[PDB]
Amino acid sequence: QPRKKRPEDFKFGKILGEGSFSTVVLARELATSREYAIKILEKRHIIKENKVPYVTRERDVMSRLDHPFFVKLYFTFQDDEKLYFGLSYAKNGELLKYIRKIGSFDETCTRFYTAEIVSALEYLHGKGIIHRDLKPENILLNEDMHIQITDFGTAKVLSNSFVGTAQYVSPELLTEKSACKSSDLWALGCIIYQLVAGLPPFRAGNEYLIFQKIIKLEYDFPEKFFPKARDLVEKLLVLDATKRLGCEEMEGYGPLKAHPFFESVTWENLHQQTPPKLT
Numbered sequence: 001q002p003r004k005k006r007p008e009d010f011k012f013g014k015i016l017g018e019g020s021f022s023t024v025v026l027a028r029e030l031a032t033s034r035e036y037a038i039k040i041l042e043k044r045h046i047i048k049e050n051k052v053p054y055v056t057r058e059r060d061v062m063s064r065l066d067h068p069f070f071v072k073l074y075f076t077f078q079d080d081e082k083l084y085f086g087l088s089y090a091k092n093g094e095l096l097k098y099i100r101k102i103g104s105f106d107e108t109c110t111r112f113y114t115a116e117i118v119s120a121l122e123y124l125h126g127k128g129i130i131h132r133d134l135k136p137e138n139i140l141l142n143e144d145m146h147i148q149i150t151d152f153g154t155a156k157v158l159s160n161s162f163v164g165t166a167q168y169v170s171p172e173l174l175t176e177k178s179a180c181k182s183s184d185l186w187a188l189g190c191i192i193y194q195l196v197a198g199l200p201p202f203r204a205g206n207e208y209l210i211f212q213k214i215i216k217l218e219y220d221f222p223e224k225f226f227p228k229a230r231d232l233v234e235k236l237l238v239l240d241a242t243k244r245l246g247c248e249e250m251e252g253y254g255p256l257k258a259h260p261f262f263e264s265v266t267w268e269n270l271h272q273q274t275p276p277k278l279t
């Protein structure tokens with residue numbers, strides 16, 4: 001590989017995002033003119049907080065991902081106080097940003113971007129990995145407007161430690177501290193609802209209220225909801241995780257990709273296709 005890089009190799013700029021144990025900063029590599037999104041983590045804070053297992057697992061999962069619908073790790077290096085991860089810069093930002101600005105997607109865009117997410121999850125789960133915190137803030141759009149899914153600190157590599165954003169948490173989490181590939185499919189059913197309705201399916205004044213509706217399966221479809229989308233969503237937001245379309249007990253991604261909502265989809269070269277214009 002090329003020699004290890006250093007902070008001094010980069011012109012740092014704009015902060016792209018702030019996590020709890022990391023900041024992501026836009027950097028341009030001097031020698032190449034390339035722009036990376038560099039995730040910076042301070043060792044003391046990680047060690048103090050007992051996150052070494054999470055930082056490690058993050059780097060490790062990201063090293064194993066070789067697929068266009070995922071953020072790529074290009075390099076890592078380290079000074080005395082900090083860790084740096086050279087990641088793909090997603091030029092167009094969060095999917096949630098677009099949900100906000102156009103309110104919700106028409107059927108073509110829902111179907112295109114839903115399909116990409118399904119195809120991303122098929123690959124991920126193929127390698128025995130659970131994202132565990134899938135959501136519109138985690139799904140970035142590169143400058144071609146294809147998705148790039150990020151944020152793998154909280155991911156789990158198959159062979160129950162209490163993660164998740166409230167809106168997208170699956171029942172089994174609230175019930176057994178359990179998580180499986182189907183937890184991600186739950187999140188999918190939530191994200192789909194949100195693409196169409198323009199809003200997460202379970203919403204309440206606070207986390208506890210949210211968790212209540214979730215385990216009760218307490219949410220409703222607006223009348224304008226595309227029927228074939230609604231139908232698919234109903235086969236994902238199933239309290240029983242062994243009966244969610246797309247999971248191993250349901251015989252996997254074949255039946256999920258076969259679902260009528262995806263009738264017009266060509267799964268085979270999704271990232272070669274030209275994304276429908278939003279809105």
Ligand SMILES: O=c1[nH]ccc2cc(-c3ccccc3CO)ccc12
Pocket residue numbers: 016017018019023024037071087088089090091093094137138140150151
């Ligand atoms: O461009 C990026 N590449 C890889 C990761 C990444 C991550 C973020 C981020 C970071 C922290 C909190 C929220 C967010 C979401 O905005 C932004 C841009 C990128």
